[PDB]
Design an enzyme around this catalytic site. Structure first.
Site, PDB file in Angstrom:
ATOM      1  NE  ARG B  37      -3.612   1.772   1.038  1.00 27.26           N
ATOM      2  CZ  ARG B  37      -3.836   2.887   1.875  1.00 27.26           C
ATOM      3  NH1 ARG B  37      -4.430   2.646   2.930  1.00 27.26           N
ATOM      4  NH2 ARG B  37      -3.855   3.785   1.360  1.00 27.26           N
ATOM      5  NE  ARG B  71       0.911   3.446  13.262  1.00 26.56           N
ATOM      6  CZ  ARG B  71      -0.084   3.476  13.206  1.00 26.56           C
ATOM      7  NH1 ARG B  71      -0.949   3.641  12.019  1.00 26.56           N
ATOM      8  NH2 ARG B  71      -0.821   3.010  14.154  1.00 26.56           N
ATOM      9  CD  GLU B 197      -1.325   9.863   3.969  1.00 29.86           C
ATOM     10  OE1 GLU B 197      -2.574  10.211   3.588  1.00 29.86           O
ATOM     11  OE2 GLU B 197      -1.382   8.930   4.358  1.00 29.86           O
ATOM     12  N   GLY B 217     -10.326  20.062   7.296  1.00 28.91           N
ATOM     13  CA  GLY B 217     -10.692  20.370   5.751  1.00 28.91           C
ATOM     14  C   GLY B 217     -10.948  19.546   4.743  1.00 28.91           C
ATOM     15  N   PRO B 267     -12.044  11.041   7.050  1.00 26.30           N
ATOM     16  CG  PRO B 267     -10.250  10.522   8.643  1.00 26.30           C
ATOM     17  CD  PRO B 267     -11.410   9.928   8.070  1.00 26.30           C
ATOM     18  CE1 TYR B 325      -4.313   7.263   1.514  1.00 24.45           C
ATOM     19  CE2 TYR B 325      -1.777   7.154   1.832  1.00 24.45           C
ATOM     20  CZ  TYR B 325      -3.104   7.275   2.490  1.00 24.45           C
ATOM     21  OH  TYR B 325      -3.184   7.419   3.676  1.00 24.45           O
TER      22      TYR B 325
END
Ligand SMILES: *[C@@H]1O[C@H](CO)[C@@H](O[C@@H]2O[C@H](CO)[C@@H](O[C@@H]3O[C@H](CO[C@H]4O[C@H](CO[C@H]5O[C@H](CO)[C@@H](O)[C@H](O)[C@@H]5O)[C@@H](O)[C@H](O[C@H]5O[C@H](CO)[C@@H](O)[C@H](O)[C@@H]5O)[C@@H]4O)[C@@H](O)[C@H](O[C@H]4O[C@H](CO)[C@@H](O)[C@H](O)[C@@H]4O)[C@@H]3O)[C@H](O)[C@H]2NC(C)=O)[C@H](O)[C@H]1NC(C)=O
Ligand SMILES: *[C@@H]1O[C@H](CO)[C@@H](O[C@@H]2O[C@H](CO)[C@@H](O[C@@H]3O[C@H](CO[C@H]4O[C@H](CO[C@H]5O[C@H](CO)[C@@H](O)[C@H](O)[C@@H]5O)[C@@H](O)[C@H](O[C@H]5O[C@H](CO)[C@@H](O)[C@H](O)[C@@H]5O)[C@@H]4O)[C@@H](O)[C@H](O)[C@@H]3O)[C@H](O)[C@H]2NC(C)=O)[C@H](O)[C@H]1NC(C)=O
Ligand SMILES: *[C@@H]1O[C@H](CO)[C@@H](O[C@@H]2O[C@H](CO)[C@@H](O[C@@H]3O[C@H](CO[C@H]4O[C@H](CO[C@H]5O[C@H](CO)[C@@H](O)[C@H](O)[C@@H]5O)[C@@H](O)[C@H](O[C@H]5O[C@H](CO)[C@@H](O)[C@H](O)[C@@H]5O)[C@@H]4O)[C@@H](O)[C@H](O)[C@@H]3O)[C@H](O)[C@H]2NC(C)=O)[C@H](O)[C@H]1NC(C)=O
Ligand SMILES: *[C@@H]1O[C@H](CO)[C@@H](O[C@@H]2O[C@H](CO)[C@@H](O[C@@H]3O[C@H](CO[C@H]4O[C@H](CO[C@H]5O[C@H](CO)[C@@H](O)[C@H](O)[C@@H]5O)[C@@H](O)[C@H](O[C@H]5O[C@H](CO)[C@@H](O)[C@H](O)[C@@H]5O)[C@@H]4O)[C@@H](O)[C@H](O)[C@@H]3O)[C@H](O)[C@H]2NC(C)=O)[C@H](O)[C@H]1NC(C)=O
Ligand SMILES: *[C@@H]1O[C@H](CO)[C@@H](O[C@@H]2O[C@H](CO)[C@@H](O)[C@H](O)[C@H]2NC(C)=O)[C@H](O)[C@H]1NC(C)=O
Ligand SMILES: *[C@@H]1O[C@H](CO)[C@@H](O[C@@H]2O[C@H](CO)[C@@H](O)[C@H](O)[C@H]2NC(C)=O)[C@H](O)[C@H]1NC(C)=O
Ligand SMILES: CC(=O)N[C@H]1[C@H]([C@H](O)[C@H](O)CO)OC(C(=O)O)=C[C@@H]1O
Ligand SMILES: CC(=O)N[C@H]1[C@H]([C@H](O)[C@H](O)CO)OC(C(=O)O)=C[C@@H]1O
Ligand SMILES: CC(=O)N[C@H]1[C@H]([C@H](O)[C@H](O)CO)OC(C(=O)O)=C[C@@H]1O
Ligand SMILES: CC(=O)N[C@H]1[C@H]([C@H](O)[C@H](O)CO)OC(C(=O)O)=C[C@@H]1O
Ligand SMILES: *[C@@H]1O[C@H](CO)[C@@H](O)[C@H](O)[C@H]1NC(C)=O
Ligand SMILES: *[C@@H]1O[C@H](CO)[C@@H](O)[C@H](O)[C@H]1NC(C)=O
Ligand SMILES: *[C@@H]1O[C@H](CO)[C@@H](O)[C@H](O)[C@H]1NC(C)=O
Ligand SMILES: [Ca+2]
Ligand SMILES: [Ca+2]
Ligand SMILES: [Ca+2]
Ligand SMILES: [Ca+2]
Ligand SMILES: [Ca+2]
Lengths: 389, 389, 389, 389
Positions: B37, B71, B197, B217, B267, B325
């Site tokens: 990932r 992790r 990120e 945001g 989020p 992503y």
């Protein structure tokens, strides 16, 4: 390219950073990964490589059955790119046998493997990927060597070898090589009573080998080698902090010149230490009895002071997880003004501690020194043995 | 070889052409492909490579079970030849850990990985394949970084790191490296309220990082870095075209200087944008709720105008397929007079959206700008989840 | 190292010697071999490589189901060391797409792939491993190219592309590249009525492309390119020996300037010829109906004489075995005073001819000319379909 | 960087040290290892590689069924890094066919493979990885060659080939190559009555080839070649120590000039010897009947003395294990004043001796000379045939 000279001091070490981990057993559950044991790392001008003794079978292969056994005609020293797992596809065969060492002299790599039957073993000494020298057994009882890297200075790479009983006085020699040719052979002298599986490093013109007394001591012998004069001395680690396995409780004082005996049920494991006055670190299994857990203890003056105790510690492998052998290496070709200690821990899976499987193998974790105070966690193997049942 | 200087402007982009696609999940249904990932790409003078965080298991392996977890001690940054799928046989371990960045400065590659427990993580910074620098957590809460490439100028490569809460104010820093050594550290300044990120690229001596506000945001923060003065500013993307996920409906006006809240249930997600006045392109998931679909929107003056909206669109991944992503990279060593924007999309398969398997992994698709008006189709992952049941 | 020029004459060819065979389906029954189709070979100063369009799955994988389909987002042009079979571990992704060509100009390699939906495909043109140029569809119907190598002279590499119907007039262009940049685009001129899948070779400063007329002709179109003028002409092979599949019985007389119609059930297959006066060889399937068998026929003056027939033959693949596409290549960097013809045959296994499996793939065989009179045997694929049931 | 000259004498040999062992069958029980037979080793200025004839299938593959058969269109000569096992992933295809030789001349490698039907085989001669020359069958009956390395002197590399009956007089030739081009062809002369599978080495400007007489002799023919004059003589090993298989009991006297006949049930096996007066070593199977066991015998003046017998022995493979072909090679580029003899033994597993599996394959062990008196053990294949049932 030039011969490596051990001109630099050891770097200060306050904690250990992660260098590499191959996750060999997790991967090997499904991918084609060789069964191994007795791993190490060794570096050269281009970087560092992983090394180990293959068992000449993959982990999921039917031939993994019976790989607890230490010596067969199917073992070889293999090397591979640091951090990969060792497969049949990405591994270089360094030499054939069931006991090894390897080191780079700044020009080329020397690799040594012993093979043959217990009473008639021999070493073949390779340099630049070609066999140079052969050495027959001198005592007729498992001629054997370091199982971690050797170290070189001005082209001279001493290697510690032993032939003789595991459980009684044996015949240890220090053989000084250059371009794979014998420059000198010395019989072990000094106060160490038994020597196996030396973990060696160089600094400030001196090689120190921290070894395994399989006969008596739960304190580790230390050989101090002058690679220019090609002479040595031996004794034990002074510190009361005992670093072999199995071992008794640490006593009130260590002994610099004699073994501290006791411990059950096993007579030794390969290990290491870095010894540099206040800047001294001892590795050991967390268990006193079994090859379980692994901790680094900062033990100022461990080499000279029988009362020396730990001032700091770093858990490398928690005590709910299997360790194994450990050894020293250094990237002597790093762009640093000092030589930075590194070590590895062999993470043994399977027999005898996990007997629900027919095999014995390992994975590797390696760490190097930091001057910073880094956080730590456990770098255990991370395979689930139930998946292999 | 010489240090890269960000002397060129961004190329004009009217559409996006296919650069690479690894089809990792399709191939990994039978071949030995590592679970990954957080993929990205990064180039150097010789070409481009794929990167990702391995989970230290193959996709069909039993250890793929539980790879939703972000992790572990089994993760590492791996690179490989662009377009291949990541196997144990073709992958270079860059560093060990569970958050990474990597960039080439024109001479050598810098790679950084964070590892450790939540409250005591550390980064190790590698250069030219050797470990150079270590950085302990400053806020004791998942020290972490870009998950896509950094950018260098005259040997200085800024990196954005955060340590602190995912759901509250955290401590972001910009650390400026040269040959893996810290030249300067800055605390985050400006009006961005939370930074994760970051997806960064360089043009005309400016680096712009488009990041993830995981706290408030749905508009993305933007950090503008001067790699010569080693200073920065921050704010939000101005455009009303909201690009994080989850997000609310696009409002009538964006907000350059404060987060626009709302959206559910997630989020944030790593994303990117290229911001070049009229020549500005914003990526986002097609779904406002989920990591589903992926679209490029040409949004002239997105960086400056709260009323800016899309004038063209290209569907990269249709909204019947899973994305993940996305991040920026550029082949800064192309033989062109301008730097051509490139991006990837991570195509996440398995958990949590596909709960009929026990694992979570991804494949990659990457595209670069064209001045031409190219046709397009969906570059979805293309594996059939039923085959893994 | 210089740009290749095509001044040398074709070598005399009396028989064909084995160059390579990859046995990909036999090997891929157990090993991780990618599903492919549309293979070829191409050479460069260092040697020769195999090429093909991957289907982005292994042969034994569940995703091999449905690989009869020609066009998907999961295909790519891959290259590998000649003779090896194409695995996920030894293959280089040249470009992404479902139609390709590639060639080396003596300095670097150009590779072109088309991708996208039928009505909106584009080509990406790569040179030296980097994307250089994009070309949008001009006719909105499966922009496509040779599926075997291009040829270069003094930097200029012509490529034949078609966009338009498979079964009706289409829009063919010849695009002339240098370092992946467009030097000139020409509409197809001359008497060829339909052009696909050109097989091209150079000799005496002239590039000849022997193509597939999918519309009407069972004779093959021939395009003749002058790479210094960047002009061409087109017509059909004159010989009565018809070399497309499906085709009728060979008639008394060929037709240089119009398609000879007939044959059932299939409108064409990619093929090749070498056309050099008396020194002319035609390949074709042995079956006039199906992609079965493969024969080389020496047909003096095939290019110019409607009455020309075979004076010698060599069976390449017996008519009890499946063939497929065939194409030309030459090792232009051989140490000879002439350019020696080579060709390959695609050995298609699986659907639709072998419908007991769910997949379609191929293996490769390649041969080059000999002036000697060599014996021959069939180089069929060699896999047993039963093993895949 | 220069043509090899055979100037150096052979090294003194008193025992044999282990050089390499690939454990191919053990590994190939699980990993993707190709079926082979007819292995050998050959070196070059960089190192040494293993070579063999692939059967174009893996060992666990369904196509391993029927690999007892010696000749098919699916075989090829492959080479790989010494010590690895031969996989589809790590092997270079040298040439296509079912009989081979290979040698390096100091500049580049020549590889030769015969292929085709029994009555019409041909050789293709490769140099530096390009096909140079083709040679058609001259006697219409399995044109064939050494199955181990050739030897080169000042660029000239003689090769021994045979065409004709296995069980009667045949037509052998010595073909002298340079850069893959025929310099001279000689018909076999002298007293050898049949020649197959020569194992050849060079020392002091002389090449000696110790071969297989498949027609009469259980003593081995010896061809002596002057690679400068490109001339040869032939006779038989003088020694009473018979070294073919099958063979009768060693007689009271050998015969320099005629075959010593007898033995049951098989007419020959490839083998070798090193012949240097007192410094002479003969290899053979331990069994006189079957390819079982392997022993080295020091037989002073074996080349000249019909009464010569063994003064030393070393068991290479115990007589409870299968052997196979054996052959000579030398690392002519070693950093030594003499050329050190090496050999390999093919360890055949499967059919016909182990008929519980459907396949036939092998693994490799290789050893070189030592001047020391090294201990020895058996280097048998090590696989358990039960695991393949
Ligand atoms: C060959 O392939 C190419 C490559 O893709 C293709 O070229 C494209 O062609 C289309 C026209 O066919 C072009 O589409 C134009 O895109 C403009 C921008 O659209 C984006 O933004 C729109 C507004 O979004 C904001 O506002 C709305 C509320 O209004 C809100 O929901 C949004 O969140 C956001 O705030 C948006 O509506 C639009 O949505 C479409 O596309 C998305 C994917 O991104 C899809 O999910 C949606 O379902 C929907 O399809 C998009 O996100 C747009 O302004 C423009 O509209 C004008 O032109 C059209 C005619 O085309 C008029 O009908 C209309 O009234 C406007 O005047 C139009 O939709 C696109 O830009 C081209 N792309 C490129 C790269 O050139 C070719 O068509 C292909 N050829 C063939 C034959 O297939
Ligand atoms: C972020 O990560 C940092 C890196 O790990 C971490 O920093 C660590 O902080 C801890 C907590 O402050 C420090 O602990 C200190 O360590 C020293 C030395 O400890 C070691 O030696 C003692 C003495 O051992 C000898 O004597 C006893 C009894 O006579 C015998 O049992 C023993 O065999 C010896 O003879 C030993 O008791 C310690 O035992 C601990 O650790 C082991 C594993 O090493 C465990 O198995 C055991 O249960 C126990 O937990 C130890 O071996 C100590 O003397 C000080 O009092 C103090 O404890 C670390 O040194 C320090 N490490 C470094 C590298 O800085 C941070 O804490 C962490 N942050 C967070 C928030 O987690
Ligand atoms: C050792 O190896 C040598 C090379 O490998 C080999 O040499 C070969 O020797 C033979 C003679 O023995 C030569 O054969 C000659 O071939 C020519 C040309 O034959 C081809 O074309 C004719 C005519 O085809 C056209 O017309 C027919 C009839 O109207 C139509 O059907 C057809 O569609 C065309 O319009 C054709 O009849 C031939 O057909 C044969 O071959 C095909 C395969 O191509 C089979 O499918 C078919 O059923 C039939 O067998 C053929 O296609 C011919 O004109 C001569 O009269 C003669 O027959 C080879 O050319 C020669 N090859 C080379 C490369 O030198 C040796 O034979 C071998 N030694 C051995 C095996 O012992
Ligand atoms: C550490 O390992 C060392 C390396 O292996 C080892 O050193 C070896 O020691 C042994 C015992 O001292 C030596 O043996 C000596 O060998 C010579 C040579 O013997 C060979 O040839 C004879 C004669 O063969 C001919 O005659 C007979 C009829 O009499 C026929 O059958 C035959 O076909 C020939 O015409 C032969 O009899 C020997 O037979 C032995 O070996 C074979 C395998 O080669 C076995 O199959 C057989 O059963 C039997 O064991 C042999 O083939 C001999 O003349 C001396 O008399 C003496 O036997 C080794 O030479 C020596 N090797 C080296 C390389 O130095 C050490 O022994 C070892 N240490 C320990 C502790 O194990
Ligand atoms: C191969 O692919 C075909 C096409 O997807 C699959 O066929 C589908 O299978 C499902 C489940 O059995 C059926 O309900 C659908 O009706 C089928 N679809 C079509 C288009 O026919 C087929 O199952 C696949 N085979 C294997 C073994 O994977
Ligand atoms: C191994 O290969 C042999 C030879 O091809 C196979 O034996 C043949 O099997 C087919 C199908 O059962 C029979 O119809 C033939 O008559 C058999 N021929 C011979 C020569 O025996 C055998 O099936 C293969 N074994 C495996 C397990 O694949
Ligand atoms: C050459 C050899 O056998 N070394 C072995 C070594 C040896 O038994 C001990 O050092 C006593 O000599 O011990 C171990 C061990 O796991 O403890 C494994 C090694 O493979
Ligand atoms: C270092 C780390 O854990 N990063 C994780 C990141 C993180 O949880 C979030 O950015 C809040 O800080 O989120 C995700 C995610 O799929 O959203 C995956 C990353 O592995
Ligand atoms: C780009 C593309 O689809 N090419 C396909 C080609 C094409 O359909 C035909 O040339 C008519 O245009 O045909 C075939 C075929 O096996 O016949 C396979 C190719 O994948
Ligand atoms: C080219 C060829 O077939 N060589 C074969 C060879 C040959 O049959 C014999 O030398 C008589 O000519 O024998 C053997 C064998 O194991 O004995 C295997 C070889 O594959
Ligand atoms: C997956 O992991 C869970 C959590 O450990 C475990 O209990 C479960 O059995 C695993 N499933 C499989 C199929 O291995
Ligand atoms: C063609 O290439 C050859 C060999 O490199 C060269 O000598 C010759 O000059 C070239 N001719 C032209 C006109 O480029
Ligand atoms: C090899 O042979 C050449 C050519 O005859 C001779 O000139 C040279 O001296 C030789 N070199 C070596 C180092 O063997
Ligand atoms: Ca001990
Ligand atoms: Ca957000
Ligand atoms: Ca047609
Ligand atoms: Ca596999
Ligand atoms: Ca014989």
């Amino acid at each position: 390219r030039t011969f490596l000279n051990l001109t630099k001091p050891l770097c200060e070490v306050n904690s250990w950073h992660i260098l590499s981990k191959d996750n060999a057993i997790r991967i090997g559950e499904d991918a084609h990964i060789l069964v191994t044991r007795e791993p190490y790392l060794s570096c050269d001008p281009q970087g560092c490589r992983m090394f180990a003794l293959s068992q000449g079978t993959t982990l999921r292969g039917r031939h993994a059955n019976g790989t607890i056994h230490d010596r067969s005609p199917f073992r070889a020293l293999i090397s591979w790119e640091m951090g990969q797992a060792p497969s049949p596809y990405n591994t270089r065969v360094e030499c054939i046998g069931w006991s090894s060492t390897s080191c780079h002299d700044g020009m080329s790599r020397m690799s040594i493997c012993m093979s043959g039957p217990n009473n008639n073993a021999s070493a073949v000494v390779w340099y630049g990927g070609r066999p140079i020298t052969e050495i027959p057994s001198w005592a007729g009882n498992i001629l054997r060597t370091q199982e971690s890297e050797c170290v070189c200075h001005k082209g001279v790479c001493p290697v510690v070898m032993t032939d003789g009983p595991a459980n009684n006085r044996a015949a240890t020699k220090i053989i000084y090589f250059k371009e794979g040719k014998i420059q000198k052979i010395e019989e072990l002298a000094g106060n160490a009573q038994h020597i196996e599986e030396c973990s060696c490093y160089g600094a400030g013109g001196v090689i120190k080998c921290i070894c395994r007394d399989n006969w008596k001591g739960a304190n580790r012998p230390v050989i101090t080698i002058d690679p220019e004069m090609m002479t040595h001395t031996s004794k034990y680690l002074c510190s009361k902090v005992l670093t072999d396995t199995s071992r008794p409780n640490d006593p009130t004082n260590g002994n610099c010149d004699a073994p501290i005996t006791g411990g059950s049920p096993d007579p030794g494991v390969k290990g290491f230490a870095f010894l540099d006055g206040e800047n001294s670190w001892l590795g050991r299994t967390i268990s006193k009895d079994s090859r379980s857990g692994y901790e680094m203890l900062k033990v100022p003056n461990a080499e000279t002071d029988i009362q020396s105790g730990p001032i700091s510690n770093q858990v490398i492998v928690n005590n709910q997880n299997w360790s194994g052998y450990s050894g020293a290496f250094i990237d002597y070709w790093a762009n640093k003004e000092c030589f930075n200690p590194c070590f590895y821990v062999e993470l043994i899976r399977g027999r005898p501690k996990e007997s629900s499987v027919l095999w014995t193998s390992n994975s590797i974790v390696a760490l190097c020194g930091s001057k910073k105070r880094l956080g730590s966690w456990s770098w255990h193997d991370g395979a689930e043995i139930i998946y292999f049942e």
